Amino acid sequence: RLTELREDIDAILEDPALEGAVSGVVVVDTATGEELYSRDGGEQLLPASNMKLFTAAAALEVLGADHSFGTEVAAESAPGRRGEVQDLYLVGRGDPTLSAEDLDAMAAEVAASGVRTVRGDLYADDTWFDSERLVDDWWPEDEPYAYSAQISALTVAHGERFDTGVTEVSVTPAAEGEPADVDLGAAEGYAELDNRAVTGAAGSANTLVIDRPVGTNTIAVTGSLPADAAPVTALRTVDEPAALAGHLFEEALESNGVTVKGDVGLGGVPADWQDAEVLADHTSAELSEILVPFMKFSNNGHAEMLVKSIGQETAGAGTWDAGLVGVEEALSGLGVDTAGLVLNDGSGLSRGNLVTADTVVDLLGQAGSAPWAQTWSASLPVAGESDPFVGGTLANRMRGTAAEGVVEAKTGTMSGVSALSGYVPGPEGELAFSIVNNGHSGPAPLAVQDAIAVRLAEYAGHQAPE
Ligand SMILES: *[B]([O])([O])[C][N]C(=O)C1=[C][C]=[C][C]=C1Cl
Ligand SMILES: [Mg+2]
Ligand SMILES: [Mg+2]
């Protein structure tokens, strides 16, 4: 059974899809500590999203399962008989789940408090973190896309998945020969529009492209959309998330009967502010629940924001160098051995990240007996579960296998990088595993990953649901 398995796993790692890859593969029976399988466990590799495992663990250690995030609106002094204020401030403190709705509720409060006219200017204040929007080694050509959304303390998250710092672009065909309609969404009147796109003949080739040319706040739409085609939605990022938050707030305010007379822009609450009058606040859900969309779907924005929030908590510094040391620290404090870990971001988007599989599993261990173990394990995707908020990035993997509904694991993926790491809970004992592969040249080796996970479910004592 023990030896049978090792031979099995060896055979699974023979796949011609792992030609020239290096693969870190480690299993450990968590109840005993018995090492069921080690290949290249000490090997350093790019984790892609498995980096989140470390990030998520630190944040629970540093902020607690109970931490929530706040956003305030502040005028220098309360409104009067006339219901007047000068300048106005939207202050963000790193809520990663702050919606356009949450903005509206705040506009209503601002109104119910007696503001009727903002005589001066409206300022977006994201100074709780620094203004370093991107990690050095993140790639410019990735910048238009959601997962490479700019980082701020004030960022409007779109939808139930809480994608920060984007806008939904909806392109809709017209008649053949006419420009397609482009609807920028939230960023209407914020981001510039460059619509060059056209409506091709019925059943012609869909070739429409949506992009934000580097260094601009402009959405460039090119190509041709079929007259019979269903409208295309895309999540494209914008320049300066806080400014967009600022923009949508002037809209929220006017829609709650509050006239902004001036200009929207970035700016922090001035130092010469004696005793700021907070005119509306909002509080996020607790870190325990934010974890779900974060880990289930692999929100890069969330991981980074959580890094800077650790920097704030440990050093009063909403910063990358700060928060990342905070992560190594908290991980050590947990009993993790962080020698082979190189930390460059919280999301794992950076090719500067390195981890080993011994380290990953080491972490799986400590995490499993932390006071916050349940809320941590709840956050992971569950093999083959059809509910997006449960199956997460595993929803359409491993369906109808022994792994289904039992294996809890985080995935990770980019060019030449795939990883799966997590638990196999058994009527035997609860297993922990890490599989991390680099340098494969073909399609991401998901079959291999799945086969191993499925074997470990079977060794754990499970059968495929029929
Ligand atoms: B995890 O594997 O999702 C981290 N990686 C990414 O999110 C990613 C990296 C490079 C290109 C696209 C994506 Cl989604
Ligand atoms: Mg607008
Ligand atoms: Mg099962």
Tab-separated table of C-alpha atoms and ligand atoms in Angstrom:
chain	number	residue	atom	x	y	z
A	1	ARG	CA	0.000	0.000	0.000
A	2	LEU	CA	2.802	2.398	0.974
A	3	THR	CA	5.225	1.071	-1.680
A	4	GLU	CA	2.496	0.411	-4.271
A	5	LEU	CA	1.669	4.116	-4.058
A	6	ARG	CA	5.228	5.362	-4.531
A	7	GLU	CA	5.549	3.260	-7.675
A	8	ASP	CA	2.198	4.644	-8.852
A	9	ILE	CA	3.235	8.243	-8.269
A	10	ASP	CA	6.576	7.622	-10.047
A	11	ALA	CA	4.609	6.348	-13.043
A	12	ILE	CA	2.381	9.449	-13.021
A	13	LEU	CA	5.468	11.633	-13.098
A	14	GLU	CA	6.630	9.919	-16.335
A	15	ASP	CA	4.118	11.771	-18.478
A	16	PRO	CA	5.710	13.143	-21.695
A	17	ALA	CA	3.989	16.451	-20.720
A	18	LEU	CA	6.639	16.838	-17.961
A	19	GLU	CA	9.494	16.616	-20.498
A	20	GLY	CA	12.187	18.999	-19.231
A	21	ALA	CA	10.086	20.241	-16.292
A	22	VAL	CA	11.398	20.179	-12.740
A	23	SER	CA	8.700	18.976	-10.405
A	24	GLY	CA	8.502	19.315	-6.634
A	25	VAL	CA	6.246	16.601	-5.233
A	26	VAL	CA	5.650	15.989	-1.530
A	27	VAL	CA	3.133	14.063	0.571
A	28	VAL	CA	3.081	13.849	4.380
A	29	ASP	CA	0.622	12.038	6.678
A	30	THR	CA	-0.356	14.927	8.941
A	31	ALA	CA	-1.455	12.882	11.993
A	32	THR	CA	1.879	11.066	12.280
A	33	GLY	CA	4.343	13.231	10.347
A	34	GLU	CA	5.280	10.248	8.180
A	35	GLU	CA	6.691	11.389	4.831
A	36	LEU	CA	4.658	9.387	2.304
A	37	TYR	CA	6.423	10.912	-0.723
A	38	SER	CA	9.305	13.240	-1.470
A	39	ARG	CA	10.761	14.107	-4.849
A	40	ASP	CA	12.823	17.265	-5.193
A	41	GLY	CA	11.185	18.623	-2.004
A	42	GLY	CA	14.061	21.030	-1.369
A	43	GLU	CA	13.991	22.377	-4.927
A	44	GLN	CA	13.226	26.062	-5.344
A	45	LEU	CA	10.484	26.857	-7.843
A	46	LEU	CA	8.105	29.618	-8.999
A	47	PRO	CA	4.843	29.007	-7.104
A	48	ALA	CA	2.525	31.219	-9.187
A	49	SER	CA	-0.679	31.479	-7.059
A	50	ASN	CA	0.493	28.941	-4.377
A	51	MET	CA	2.222	32.045	-2.968
A	52	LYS	CA	-1.243	32.999	-1.655
A	53	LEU	CA	-0.971	30.063	0.781
A	54	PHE	CA	1.794	31.994	2.609
A	55	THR	CA	0.082	35.395	2.158
A	56	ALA	CA	-3.310	34.122	3.425
A	57	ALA	CA	-1.637	32.399	6.387
A	58	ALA	CA	0.316	35.497	7.508
A	59	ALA	CA	-2.729	37.732	7.239
A	60	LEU	CA	-4.651	35.474	9.578
A	61	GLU	CA	-1.715	35.423	11.963
A	62	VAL	CA	-1.201	39.245	11.820
A	63	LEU	CA	-4.741	40.675	11.395
A	64	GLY	CA	-6.760	37.794	12.865
A	65	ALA	CA	-9.797	36.002	11.498
A	66	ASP	CA	-11.895	38.889	12.908
A	67	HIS	CA	-10.180	41.879	11.187
A	68	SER	CA	-12.354	44.132	9.136
A	69	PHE	CA	-11.568	47.155	6.906
A	70	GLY	CA	-12.875	50.698	6.946
A	71	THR	CA	-13.695	53.601	4.610
A	72	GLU	CA	-14.641	57.121	5.840
A	73	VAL	CA	-15.833	60.389	4.348
A	74	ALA	CA	-14.468	63.509	6.083
A	75	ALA	CA	-15.066	67.281	5.893
A	76	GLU	CA	-12.987	69.801	7.893
A	77	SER	CA	-16.030	70.691	9.950
A	78	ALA	CA	-19.692	69.669	10.022
A	79	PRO	CA	-22.241	71.266	7.670
A	80	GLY	CA	-24.350	74.170	8.931
A	81	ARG	CA	-27.768	75.752	8.565
A	82	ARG	CA	-26.849	76.164	4.925
A	83	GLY	CA	-25.645	72.547	4.800
A	84	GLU	CA	-22.254	73.583	3.392
A	85	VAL	CA	-18.707	72.145	3.427
A	86	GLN	CA	-15.600	73.154	1.464
A	87	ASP	CA	-13.383	70.300	0.372
A	88	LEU	CA	-14.410	66.665	1.011
A	89	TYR	CA	-12.430	63.448	1.533
A	90	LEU	CA	-13.038	59.835	0.624
A	91	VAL	CA	-10.558	57.988	2.858
A	92	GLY	CA	-9.779	54.353	2.071
A	93	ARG	CA	-8.013	51.972	4.473
A	94	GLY	CA	-7.489	49.003	2.203
A	95	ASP	CA	-10.946	47.427	2.039
A	96	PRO	CA	-10.621	44.949	-0.886
A	97	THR	CA	-14.374	44.371	-1.024
A	98	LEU	CA	-15.629	47.902	-1.351
A	99	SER	CA	-18.436	48.128	-3.895
A	100	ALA	CA	-20.188	50.873	-5.878
A	101	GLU	CA	-23.129	50.042	-3.646
A	102	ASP	CA	-21.031	50.671	-0.557
A	103	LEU	CA	-20.219	54.080	-2.116
A	104	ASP	CA	-23.893	54.813	-2.609
A	105	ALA	CA	-24.781	54.030	1.017
A	106	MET	CA	-22.013	56.486	1.971
A	107	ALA	CA	-23.439	59.181	-0.327
A	108	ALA	CA	-26.789	58.726	1.411
A	109	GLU	CA	-25.141	59.117	4.878
A	110	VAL	CA	-23.349	62.257	3.700
A	111	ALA	CA	-26.814	63.538	2.698
A	112	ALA	CA	-28.649	62.438	5.889
A	113	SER	CA	-25.997	64.330	7.833
A	114	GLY	CA	-26.950	67.609	6.133
A	115	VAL	CA	-24.477	68.182	3.323
A	116	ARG	CA	-26.361	69.680	0.392
A	117	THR	CA	-23.414	71.409	-1.330
A	118	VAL	CA	-19.714	70.564	-1.420
A	119	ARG	CA	-18.565	74.097	-2.183
A	120	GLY	CA	-14.949	72.995	-2.736
A	121	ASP	CA	-13.204	69.927	-4.136
A	122	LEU	CA	-13.651	66.168	-3.663
A	123	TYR	CA	-10.511	64.236	-2.746
A	124	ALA	CA	-9.776	60.523	-2.967
A	125	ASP	CA	-7.382	59.624	-0.144
A	126	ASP	CA	-5.544	56.301	-0.594
A	127	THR	CA	-2.554	57.283	1.530
A	128	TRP	CA	-2.997	54.381	4.004
A	129	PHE	CA	-0.858	52.425	1.596
A	130	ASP	CA	1.885	54.011	-0.504
A	131	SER	CA	1.331	54.938	-4.145
A	132	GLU	CA	3.528	52.168	-5.527
A	133	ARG	CA	0.926	50.702	-7.883
A	134	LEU	CA	2.922	47.691	-9.273
A	135	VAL	CA	5.713	45.314	-8.261
A	136	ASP	CA	8.954	45.932	-10.213
A	137	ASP	CA	9.049	42.610	-12.039
A	138	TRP	CA	5.367	42.469	-13.068
A	139	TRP	CA	5.119	42.663	-16.867
A	140	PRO	CA	3.904	45.862	-18.615
A	141	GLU	CA	2.028	43.910	-21.296
A	142	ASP	CA	-0.116	42.332	-18.558
A	143	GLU	CA	-1.272	45.666	-17.201
A	144	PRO	CA	-4.658	45.912	-18.990
A	145	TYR	CA	-5.922	42.724	-17.348
A	146	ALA	CA	-7.717	42.283	-13.978
A	147	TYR	CA	-5.096	40.151	-12.197
A	148	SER	CA	-2.572	42.899	-12.902
A	149	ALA	CA	-4.795	45.693	-11.550
A	150	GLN	CA	-3.016	48.586	-9.796
A	151	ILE	CA	-2.729	48.519	-6.023
A	152	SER	CA	-4.233	51.195	-3.740
A	153	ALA	CA	-5.828	51.573	-0.336
A	154	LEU	CA	-8.920	53.032	-2.051
A	155	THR	CA	-10.224	50.730	-4.685
A	156	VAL	CA	-13.735	49.896	-5.902
A	157	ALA	CA	-14.175	46.122	-6.253
A	158	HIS	CA	-16.481	44.930	-9.052
A	159	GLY	CA	-19.063	42.160	-8.481
A	160	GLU	CA	-19.511	39.271	-6.032
A	161	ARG	CA	-15.940	38.155	-6.820
A	162	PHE	CA	-14.609	41.504	-5.611
A	163	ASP	CA	-12.222	42.163	-8.496
A	164	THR	CA	-10.479	45.392	-7.469
A	165	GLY	CA	-9.575	48.254	-9.710
A	166	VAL	CA	-11.211	47.287	-12.944
A	167	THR	CA	-14.160	48.293	-15.022
A	168	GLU	CA	-16.484	46.121	-17.062
A	169	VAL	CA	-16.289	46.908	-20.739
A	170	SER	CA	-19.292	45.775	-22.798
A	171	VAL	CA	-19.041	45.797	-26.573
A	172	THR	CA	-22.240	45.361	-28.534
A	173	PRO	CA	-22.632	44.876	-32.281
A	174	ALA	CA	-24.793	47.333	-34.248
A	175	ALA	CA	-25.657	46.911	-37.964
A	176	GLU	CA	-23.119	45.591	-40.457
A	177	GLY	CA	-20.751	48.467	-41.257
A	178	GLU	CA	-21.528	50.588	-38.184
A	179	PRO	CA	-19.248	51.179	-35.263
A	180	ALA	CA	-19.897	48.715	-32.466
A	181	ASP	CA	-21.190	50.345	-29.279
A	182	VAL	CA	-18.627	50.344	-26.443
A	183	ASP	CA	-19.874	50.754	-22.957
A	184	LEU	CA	-17.027	51.475	-20.496
A	185	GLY	CA	-19.119	50.775	-17.376
A	186	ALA	CA	-17.977	52.334	-14.063
A	187	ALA	CA	-15.158	54.177	-15.860
A	188	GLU	CA	-17.601	56.176	-18.041
A	189	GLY	CA	-16.311	59.739	-17.917
A	190	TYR	CA	-13.164	58.597	-16.176
A	191	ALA	CA	-11.177	56.502	-18.641
A	192	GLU	CA	-10.760	57.818	-22.154
A	193	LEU	CA	-12.395	55.990	-25.054
A	194	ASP	CA	-10.776	54.986	-28.334
A	195	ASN	CA	-13.390	53.162	-30.331
A	196	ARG	CA	-12.140	51.923	-33.732
A	197	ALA	CA	-14.192	48.734	-33.615
A	198	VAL	CA	-16.759	47.811	-36.285
A	199	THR	CA	-19.687	45.442	-36.746
A	200	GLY	CA	-18.792	42.832	-39.311
A	201	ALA	CA	-21.299	40.996	-41.470
A	202	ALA	CA	-23.489	38.267	-39.848
A	203	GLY	CA	-21.395	35.160	-39.126
A	204	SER	CA	-18.101	36.818	-40.116
A	205	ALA	CA	-15.002	36.329	-37.987
A	206	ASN	CA	-15.028	37.676	-34.412
A	207	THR	CA	-11.801	39.647	-34.125
A	208	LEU	CA	-12.589	42.353	-31.610
A	209	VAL	CA	-9.786	43.279	-29.143
A	210	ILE	CA	-10.090	45.386	-25.963
A	211	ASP	CA	-6.928	46.903	-24.466
A	212	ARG	CA	-5.534	49.768	-22.360
A	213	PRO	CA	-2.395	50.884	-24.189
A	214	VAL	CA	0.519	51.080	-21.749
A	215	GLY	CA	0.974	54.390	-19.949
A	216	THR	CA	-2.581	55.552	-20.721
A	217	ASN	CA	-5.965	55.788	-19.093
A	218	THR	CA	-7.577	55.062	-22.500
A	219	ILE	CA	-9.557	51.964	-23.533
A	220	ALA	CA	-8.629	51.116	-27.045
A	221	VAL	CA	-11.176	49.004	-28.850
A	222	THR	CA	-10.158	47.511	-32.172
A	223	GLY	CA	-11.362	44.854	-34.590
A	224	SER	CA	-14.733	43.684	-35.829
A	225	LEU	CA	-17.681	42.138	-33.986
A	226	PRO	CA	-20.246	39.985	-35.881
A	227	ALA	CA	-23.756	41.471	-36.244
A	228	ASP	CA	-25.242	38.260	-34.755
A	229	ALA	CA	-22.686	37.971	-31.999
A	230	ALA	CA	-23.596	38.064	-28.364
A	231	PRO	CA	-22.195	41.209	-26.639
A	232	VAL	CA	-18.653	40.719	-25.276
A	233	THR	CA	-17.899	41.625	-21.627
A	234	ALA	CA	-14.336	42.115	-20.426
A	235	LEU	CA	-12.699	43.187	-17.201
A	236	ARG	CA	-10.111	45.818	-18.037
A	237	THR	CA	-8.099	47.687	-15.343
A	238	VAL	CA	-7.775	51.467	-15.023
A	239	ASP	CA	-5.032	53.950	-14.082
A	240	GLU	CA	-5.316	55.164	-10.444
A	241	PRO	CA	-8.043	53.049	-8.756
A	242	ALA	CA	-8.536	55.711	-6.035
A	243	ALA	CA	-9.343	58.358	-8.732
A	244	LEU	CA	-12.032	56.046	-10.147
A	245	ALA	CA	-13.386	55.571	-6.610
A	246	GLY	CA	-13.291	59.421	-6.419
A	247	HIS	CA	-15.136	59.708	-9.709
A	248	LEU	CA	-17.903	57.200	-8.825
A	249	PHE	CA	-18.371	58.997	-5.519
A	250	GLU	CA	-19.103	62.388	-7.142
A	251	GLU	CA	-21.742	60.381	-9.074
A	252	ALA	CA	-23.086	58.715	-5.900
A	253	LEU	CA	-23.266	62.159	-4.244
A	254	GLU	CA	-25.162	63.895	-7.055
A	255	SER	CA	-27.482	60.903	-7.132
A	256	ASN	CA	-28.175	61.503	-3.359
A	257	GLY	CA	-28.944	65.204	-3.849
A	258	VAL	CA	-25.464	66.445	-2.939
A	259	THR	CA	-23.931	68.911	-5.397
A	260	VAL	CA	-20.176	68.795	-5.828
A	261	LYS	CA	-19.160	72.270	-7.053
A	262	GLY	CA	-15.466	71.562	-7.682
A	263	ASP	CA	-13.024	68.982	-8.983
A	264	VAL	CA	-12.287	65.306	-8.288
A	265	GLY	CA	-8.617	64.310	-7.812
A	266	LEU	CA	-6.109	62.563	-5.545
A	267	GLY	CA	-5.239	64.175	-2.215
A	268	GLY	CA	-4.784	63.146	1.405
A	269	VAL	CA	-6.498	64.665	4.412
A	270	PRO	CA	-4.341	67.761	5.212
A	271	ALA	CA	-2.244	67.959	8.406
A	272	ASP	CA	-3.692	71.386	9.366
A	273	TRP	CA	-7.021	69.556	9.936
A	274	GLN	CA	-7.798	70.195	13.556
A	275	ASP	CA	-10.625	67.759	14.335
A	276	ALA	CA	-11.953	66.107	11.170
A	277	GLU	CA	-15.730	65.613	10.971
A	278	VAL	CA	-16.401	62.053	9.735
A	279	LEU	CA	-19.660	62.299	7.750
A	280	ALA	CA	-20.006	58.647	6.657
A	281	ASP	CA	-18.187	55.400	7.330
A	282	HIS	CA	-18.445	51.818	6.015
A	283	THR	CA	-16.975	48.591	7.440
A	284	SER	CA	-16.126	45.450	5.464
A	285	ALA	CA	-16.957	41.814	6.207
A	286	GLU	CA	-14.423	40.054	8.395
A	287	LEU	CA	-11.166	38.730	6.984
A	288	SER	CA	-12.601	35.180	7.436
A	289	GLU	CA	-15.232	35.855	4.733
A	290	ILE	CA	-13.029	37.986	2.478
A	291	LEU	CA	-10.776	34.862	2.369
A	292	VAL	CA	-13.375	32.972	0.366
A	293	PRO	CA	-13.420	34.972	-2.879
A	294	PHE	CA	-9.752	35.692	-2.354
A	295	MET	CA	-8.564	32.032	-2.256
A	296	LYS	CA	-11.408	30.282	-4.186
A	297	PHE	CA	-10.758	32.464	-7.253
A	298	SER	CA	-7.157	33.615	-6.766
A	299	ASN	CA	-7.571	37.379	-6.406
A	300	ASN	CA	-4.123	38.938	-6.924
A	301	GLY	CA	-5.318	42.384	-5.894
A	302	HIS	CA	-6.574	40.905	-2.615
A	303	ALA	CA	-3.243	39.238	-1.787
A	304	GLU	CA	-1.266	42.403	-2.465
A	305	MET	CA	-3.683	44.634	-0.463
A	306	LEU	CA	-3.404	42.152	2.423
A	307	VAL	CA	0.398	42.436	2.190
A	308	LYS	CA	0.320	46.199	2.608
A	309	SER	CA	-2.237	45.798	5.426
A	310	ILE	CA	0.331	43.581	7.266
A	311	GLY	CA	2.908	46.333	6.709
A	312	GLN	CA	0.434	48.714	8.275
A	313	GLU	CA	-0.278	46.408	11.226
A	314	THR	CA	3.343	45.482	12.045
A	315	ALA	CA	5.181	48.661	11.035
A	316	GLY	CA	2.510	51.325	10.355
A	317	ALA	CA	3.685	51.289	6.734
A	318	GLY	CA	1.335	50.197	3.919
A	319	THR	CA	4.170	49.032	1.820
A	320	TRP	CA	5.629	46.123	-0.096
A	321	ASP	CA	9.093	45.882	1.602
A	322	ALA	CA	7.326	46.308	4.940
A	323	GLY	CA	4.507	43.792	4.450
A	324	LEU	CA	6.706	41.113	2.926
A	325	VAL	CA	9.075	41.016	5.906
A	326	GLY	CA	5.839	40.869	7.957
A	327	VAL	CA	4.983	37.682	6.081
A	328	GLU	CA	8.328	35.925	6.612
A	329	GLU	CA	8.092	36.989	10.262
A	330	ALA	CA	4.554	35.701	10.861
A	331	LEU	CA	5.388	32.474	9.002
A	332	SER	CA	8.435	31.827	11.244
A	333	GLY	CA	6.326	32.663	14.303
A	334	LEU	CA	3.988	29.929	13.178
A	335	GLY	CA	6.893	27.481	13.351
A	336	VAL	CA	7.487	27.455	9.600
A	337	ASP	CA	11.056	27.146	8.313
A	338	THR	CA	11.336	29.868	5.690
A	339	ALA	CA	14.908	29.279	4.417
A	340	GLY	CA	13.988	28.242	0.872
A	341	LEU	CA	11.324	30.924	0.496
A	342	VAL	CA	11.958	34.091	-1.499
A	343	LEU	CA	9.096	36.568	-1.190
A	344	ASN	CA	8.554	39.233	-3.895
A	345	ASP	CA	4.793	39.623	-3.760
A	346	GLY	CA	1.706	38.385	-1.954
A	347	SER	CA	-0.118	37.035	-5.014
A	348	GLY	CA	2.608	35.038	-6.657
A	349	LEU	CA	2.224	37.023	-9.847
A	350	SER	CA	5.923	37.938	-9.612
A	351	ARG	CA	8.558	35.692	-11.179
A	352	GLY	CA	10.701	36.761	-8.244
A	353	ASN	CA	8.734	34.493	-5.979
A	354	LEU	CA	10.378	31.142	-5.142
A	355	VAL	CA	9.199	28.334	-2.837
A	356	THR	CA	10.040	24.661	-2.333
A	357	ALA	CA	7.484	21.895	-1.844
A	358	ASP	CA	8.895	20.939	1.555
A	359	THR	CA	8.155	24.535	2.574
A	360	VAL	CA	4.620	24.499	1.163
A	361	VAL	CA	3.790	21.289	3.043
A	362	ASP	CA	5.566	22.554	6.151
A	363	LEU	CA	3.045	25.419	5.977
A	364	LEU	CA	0.110	23.100	5.312
A	365	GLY	CA	1.083	21.429	8.586
A	366	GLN	CA	1.238	24.480	10.852
A	367	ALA	CA	-1.797	26.010	9.268
A	368	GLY	CA	-3.715	22.771	10.052
A	369	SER	CA	-3.240	23.147	13.814
A	370	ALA	CA	-3.405	26.952	14.056
A	371	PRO	CA	-6.358	28.435	16.037
A	372	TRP	CA	-7.618	29.668	12.635
A	373	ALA	CA	-7.474	26.306	10.821
A	374	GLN	CA	-11.140	26.004	9.829
A	375	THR	CA	-11.523	29.435	8.208
A	376	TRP	CA	-8.242	28.775	6.399
A	377	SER	CA	-9.371	25.389	5.050
A	378	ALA	CA	-12.810	26.778	4.137
A	379	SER	CA	-11.075	29.245	1.805
A	380	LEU	CA	-9.533	26.550	-0.444
A	381	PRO	CA	-11.200	25.301	-3.642
A	382	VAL	CA	-12.809	21.887	-3.251
A	383	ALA	CA	-12.131	19.400	-6.038
A	384	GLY	CA	-14.912	19.121	-8.617
A	385	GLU	CA	-17.579	21.134	-6.816
A	386	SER	CA	-19.973	22.783	-9.298
A	387	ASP	CA	-20.767	25.800	-7.119
A	388	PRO	CA	-18.261	28.539	-8.126
A	389	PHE	CA	-17.959	29.715	-4.471
A	390	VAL	CA	-17.047	26.213	-3.316
A	391	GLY	CA	-15.354	24.490	-6.175
A	392	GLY	CA	-13.571	27.732	-7.018
A	393	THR	CA	-10.718	27.224	-9.502
A	394	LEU	CA	-11.274	23.483	-9.045
A	395	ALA	CA	-14.977	23.522	-10.085
A	396	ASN	CA	-14.371	21.675	-13.420
A	397	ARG	CA	-11.475	19.534	-12.355
A	398	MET	CA	-11.594	15.997	-10.888
A	399	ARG	CA	-15.422	15.667	-11.116
A	400	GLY	CA	-16.685	12.101	-10.522
A	401	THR	CA	-13.392	10.845	-9.007
A	402	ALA	CA	-12.393	9.807	-5.472
A	403	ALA	CA	-11.008	13.335	-5.180
A	404	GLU	CA	-14.439	14.922	-5.675
A	405	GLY	CA	-15.797	16.845	-2.710
A	406	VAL	CA	-12.892	15.714	-0.524
A	407	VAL	CA	-9.587	17.196	-1.853
A	408	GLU	CA	-9.082	20.838	-0.710
A	409	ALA	CA	-6.290	22.552	-2.686
A	410	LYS	CA	-4.947	25.807	-4.126
A	411	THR	CA	-3.855	25.967	-7.731
A	412	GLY	CA	-1.311	28.165	-9.417
A	413	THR	CA	-0.604	28.837	-13.077
A	414	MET	CA	1.378	30.819	-15.623
A	415	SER	CA	3.767	30.276	-18.574
A	416	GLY	CA	5.839	27.274	-17.530
A	417	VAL	CA	4.353	27.131	-14.024
A	418	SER	CA	1.623	24.965	-12.559
A	419	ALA	CA	0.983	24.025	-8.946
A	420	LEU	CA	-1.562	22.193	-6.788
A	421	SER	CA	-1.174	21.975	-3.034
A	422	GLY	CA	-3.528	21.112	-0.201
A	423	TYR	CA	-5.193	18.418	1.832
A	424	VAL	CA	-6.681	14.993	1.349
A	425	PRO	CA	-8.817	14.370	4.420
A	426	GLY	CA	-9.087	10.636	5.124
A	427	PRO	CA	-11.102	8.004	7.061
A	428	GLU	CA	-7.444	7.050	7.530
A	429	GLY	CA	-5.835	10.416	8.499
A	430	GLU	CA	-5.610	13.893	6.945
A	431	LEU	CA	-2.893	14.064	4.220
A	432	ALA	CA	-1.023	17.199	3.119
A	433	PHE	CA	0.542	17.536	-0.323
A	434	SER	CA	2.372	19.903	-2.621
A	435	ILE	CA	2.895	19.496	-6.347
A	436	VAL	CA	4.807	22.333	-8.070
A	437	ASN	CA	6.084	22.158	-11.680
A	438	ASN	CA	8.262	24.512	-13.647
A	439	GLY	CA	9.668	24.570	-17.158
A	440	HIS	CA	7.252	22.214	-18.878
A	441	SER	CA	6.944	23.498	-22.474
A	442	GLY	CA	3.474	22.280	-23.464
A	443	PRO	CA	0.015	22.838	-21.884
A	444	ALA	CA	-0.126	23.148	-18.046
A	445	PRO	CA	0.269	19.590	-16.626
A	446	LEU	CA	-3.179	19.469	-14.968
A	447	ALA	CA	-3.797	15.795	-15.774
A	448	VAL	CA	-0.696	14.802	-13.833
A	449	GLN	CA	-1.693	17.000	-10.917
A	450	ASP	CA	-5.205	15.541	-10.894
A	451	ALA	CA	-4.028	11.919	-11.180
A	452	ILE	CA	-1.774	12.290	-8.149
A	453	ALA	CA	-4.477	14.058	-6.072
A	454	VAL	CA	-6.939	11.324	-7.064
A	455	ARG	CA	-4.500	8.560	-6.006
A	456	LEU	CA	-4.041	10.216	-2.649
A	457	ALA	CA	-7.820	10.282	-2.166
A	458	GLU	CA	-7.908	6.538	-2.902
A	459	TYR	CA	-5.002	5.766	-0.550
A	460	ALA	CA	-6.890	7.945	1.980
A	461	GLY	CA	-9.853	5.632	1.423
A	462	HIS	CA	-12.272	7.138	-1.076
A	463	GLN	CA	-14.207	6.235	-4.219
A	464	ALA	CA	-15.580	8.312	-7.088
A	465	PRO	CA	-19.220	9.327	-6.561
A	466	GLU	CA	-21.530	7.764	-9.166
B	1	LIG	B1	-2.053	32.245	-9.731
B	1	LIG	O1	-1.393	31.068	-10.459
B	1	LIG	O2	-3.436	32.579	-10.340
B	1	LIG	C1	-1.038	33.468	-9.933
B	1	LIG	N1	-0.878	33.828	-11.330
B	1	LIG	C2	-1.726	34.560	-12.041
B	1	LIG	O3	-2.744	35.013	-11.549
B	1	LIG	C3	-1.407	34.900	-13.460
B	1	LIG	C4	-0.062	35.016	-13.805
B	1	LIG	C5	0.275	35.377	-15.107
B	1	LIG	C6	-0.727	35.633	-16.048
B	1	LIG	C7	-2.069	35.525	-15.698
B	1	LIG	C8	-2.415	35.165	-14.394
B	1	LIG	CL1	-4.175	35.050	-13.961
B	2	MG	MG	-18.777	57.715	-14.489
B	3	MG	MG	-14.720	11.135	-1.834
